[PDB]
Amino acid sequence: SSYSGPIVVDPVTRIEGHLRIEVEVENGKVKNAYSSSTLFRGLEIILKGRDPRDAQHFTQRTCGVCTYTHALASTRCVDNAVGVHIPKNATYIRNLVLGAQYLHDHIVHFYHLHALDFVDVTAALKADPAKAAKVASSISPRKTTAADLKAVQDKLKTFVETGQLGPFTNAYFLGGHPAYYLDPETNLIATAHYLEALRLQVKAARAMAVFGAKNPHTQFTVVGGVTCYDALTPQRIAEFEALWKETKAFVDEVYIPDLLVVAAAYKDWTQYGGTDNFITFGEFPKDEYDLNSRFFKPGVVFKRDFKNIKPFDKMQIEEHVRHSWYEGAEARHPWKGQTQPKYTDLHGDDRYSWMKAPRYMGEPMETGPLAQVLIAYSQGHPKVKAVTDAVLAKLGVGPEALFSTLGRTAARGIETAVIAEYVGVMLQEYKDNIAKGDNVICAPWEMPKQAEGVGFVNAPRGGLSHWIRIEDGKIGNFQLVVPSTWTLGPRCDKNNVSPVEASLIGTPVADAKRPVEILRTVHSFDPCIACGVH
Amino acid sequence: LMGPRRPSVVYLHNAECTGCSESVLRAFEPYIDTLILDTLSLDYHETIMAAAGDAAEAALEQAVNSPHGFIAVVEGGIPTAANGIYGKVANHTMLDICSRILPKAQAVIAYGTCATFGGVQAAKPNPTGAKGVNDALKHLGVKAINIAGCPPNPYNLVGTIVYYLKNKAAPELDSLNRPTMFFGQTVHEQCPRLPHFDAGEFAPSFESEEARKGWCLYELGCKGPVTMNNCPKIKFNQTNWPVDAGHPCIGCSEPDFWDAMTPFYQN
Ligand code: SF4
Ligand code: SF4
Ligand code: F3S
Ligand SMILES: [Mg+2]
């Protein structure tokens, strides 16, 4: 019964980008792994010799899923290099738009990219509506009637009976899989919520366009501040407030409750996908130059020792190329970095990815929701601690349980609920400041002939940082080191396995033809390949 | 995945950032749920599909070989240099999969600036020799419908498919193969700040009083006069758009805009 041999999933779907996962399973458990990113664009090569002002417009196209993050990071990078101290209103508007991005991003992940590894949409068809509406109304204050759920069931059935299953075509769950646990009622509840979140996510993206110009790819940032004078008006702030309230309602009434249900039904997933070290850049600052003035603060942990949280030293991050398709094997710190393509083939000269391997003090680091939540929790953050204790409570699991695919999935939800309420506070502070008479959004600055700067952003997936070396007023060297590079990158010159390759070790696989378990851990990291390679 | 009743659509991802896929996920009246369940049949789409690995490939092979044909929507540029080695899916070069699949499609739509004209990665020095669809496959007769933008306005995708489905032909294209109905005007002639421009009322900087008053952004780098798109009229997310948020247009729906329009803040 137990399988032994290789498994290859190319392409890994329900992620951003082009990834290939190769594992070596022995007797039903993954014994080895390799994450190969298979697309290279070379944004850093293209950037050189160009006007630093334009960088933000080029680096935002590094990704459309996490759309605003790269333009923020580039602007914070040049702002820094230039030495401007942007107005407080500019900091508010930038923070607000970012908060709205964490909500849209995270909502779409759970339902539209992660859920199908846990939920079976076909089982929903044999569900009893009346009994499902009952279970629905007892896990949330939002009451659901049998009719509400019946309308969904009818929609599905018509679709399934047409023979055209479209997105559900060769789904690993068709015909039953030994790894799907949910009973019919629950499958119907989650499916109804998968469909609702499709129309809600539009509301949550419109929130970004209120101040931003659009979504995907906003256009309101510049060096020195922001450009939207309209964001000061009562009308536009009302529109944003309306959208956030609705979006917040969905997070508290639908998302967290569903997460707890799905997680309790799969509490065995508290045993796989664990990692050792974490890093986070902190976010939502009051002072653009002080990382410790952020709502969430910076920090790094080694070997899960959350009692000894270390400070983030930016001179410690350095990227490798020994097992990547780049010339040589020399690790470089971002300010002295180089992007020199040299494609061998899969495992040619022991190289298997277009991603560099960023190491901290020579160690691989997990970053993102799990890192941002655990670090903040250990630092005694009031709100974080409040809700994660409540969540561990409902599930009846100890804190240890968080170092897993389960935890990592919980963490993303927890972070979504706290940021959702924090947007209310930044909105208030922003309203007050406006009332005090401050109507300023952009500050003056001058372009140095020679300078070097950096900008840090803790995006939905983790620690993001852009780096610029200005020489003679033009871009001499520009380097991006993104969240997925940290987690999904390859092994380094000391052969230390990356976060994802490490967490895959031990993942039990029931059926090699349908490796849903691998997809559960890989998707819990929320990988973004176009981000990781640029 | 493919059968009668609902028109089949096969969506491919080449050299891209997925921002175009995300744009379609913003469809409004009809929404994405209506389109996927009632109007079309999305038989292949790596971003949302349930199946992966071999099963994903199987689903694509099933769909392209269907007795009913299919419509293909392409996202991203194709890396050509060094024999397409810079972009591979399921161990096949993007150049191959596209050469193999596109000529079979009843209609091919290049969605976005990357697929259309090459995009961000084709910008100098173009380390991967990436090209748009018509450029990399001219030798196979593949002549796609364009729809430029970065990302394009989703209303423009829906409008092209809906026009095709009811006509089995294309609308009317310009010199660059873009629908005259969505790209027949410069954004400049549909801009609210046009009166300002006509009276030399320009803002000298963003922090200026004249910017605060909403003066024209030409001096700050607005590419609106030499760009074709429907941004001002249709707006984005039913609510805002670039200059209304006070930032000049960077001409994102034009051929070699990255090199042709830069420096963005200069005119
Ligand atoms: S045209 Fe732009 S939004 Fe679309 S995939 Fe290309 S870089 Fe992204
Ligand atoms: S130059 Fe630009 S901001 Fe000005 S009238 Fe034209 S489109 Fe409007
Ligand atoms: S920048 Fe692009 S989105 Fe429109 S306003 Fe200009 S063509
Ligand atoms: Mg880099």
CSV table of N, CA and C and ligand atoms in Angstrom, one decimal, chain B residues 187-188 191 193-194 197 216-218 222 224-225 243, ligand 2:
chain,number,residue,atom,x,y,z
B,187,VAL,N,-6.6,59.1,-24.1
B,187,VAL,CA,-7.3,59.4,-22.8
B,187,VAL,C,-7.4,60.9,-22.6
B,188,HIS,N,-6.4,61.6,-23.2
B,188,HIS,CA,-6.4,63.1,-23.1
B,188,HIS,C,-7.6,63.8,-23.6
B,191,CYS,N,-10.3,63.5,-20.9
B,191,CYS,CA,-9.8,63.9,-19.6
B,191,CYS,C,-10.6,65.1,-19.0
B,193,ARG,N,-9.5,67.3,-16.9
B,193,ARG,CA,-8.6,68.5,-16.8
B,193,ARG,C,-8.3,69.1,-18.1
B,194,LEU,N,-9.0,68.7,-19.2
B,194,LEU,CA,-8.7,69.3,-20.5
B,194,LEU,C,-8.8,70.8,-20.6
B,197,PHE,N,-5.5,72.3,-19.6
B,197,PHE,CA,-4.5,72.2,-20.7
B,197,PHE,C,-4.6,73.2,-21.8
B,216,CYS,N,-3.9,70.9,-15.0
B,216,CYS,CA,-3.4,69.7,-15.8
B,216,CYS,C,-2.0,69.2,-15.4
B,217,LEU,N,-1.8,67.9,-15.5
B,217,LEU,CA,-0.5,67.3,-15.2
B,217,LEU,C,0.5,67.1,-16.3
B,218,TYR,N,0.3,67.8,-17.4
B,218,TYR,CA,1.3,67.6,-18.6
B,218,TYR,C,2.7,67.9,-18.2
B,222,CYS,N,2.5,63.7,-17.9
B,222,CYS,CA,1.3,63.0,-18.4
B,222,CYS,C,1.4,62.5,-19.9
B,224,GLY,N,-0.9,61.0,-21.4
B,224,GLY,CA,-2.3,61.0,-22.0
B,224,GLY,C,-2.5,61.5,-23.4
B,225,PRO,N,-1.7,62.5,-23.9
B,225,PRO,CA,-1.9,62.9,-25.3
B,225,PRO,C,-1.5,61.9,-26.4
B,243,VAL,N,-5.4,60.1,-13.3
B,243,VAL,CA,-5.4,61.6,-13.0
B,243,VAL,C,-6.4,62.1,-12.0
C,2,SF4,S1,-2.1,66.2,-20.3
C,2,SF4,FE1,-3.0,64.6,-19.1
C,2,SF4,S2,-3.9,65.5,-17.2
C,2,SF4,FE2,-3.7,67.0,-18.8
C,2,SF4,S3,-5.6,67.3,-20.0
C,2,SF4,FE3,-4.2,65.7,-20.9
C,2,SF4,S4,-4.8,63.7,-20.0
C,2,SF4,FE4,-5.6,65.5,-18.7
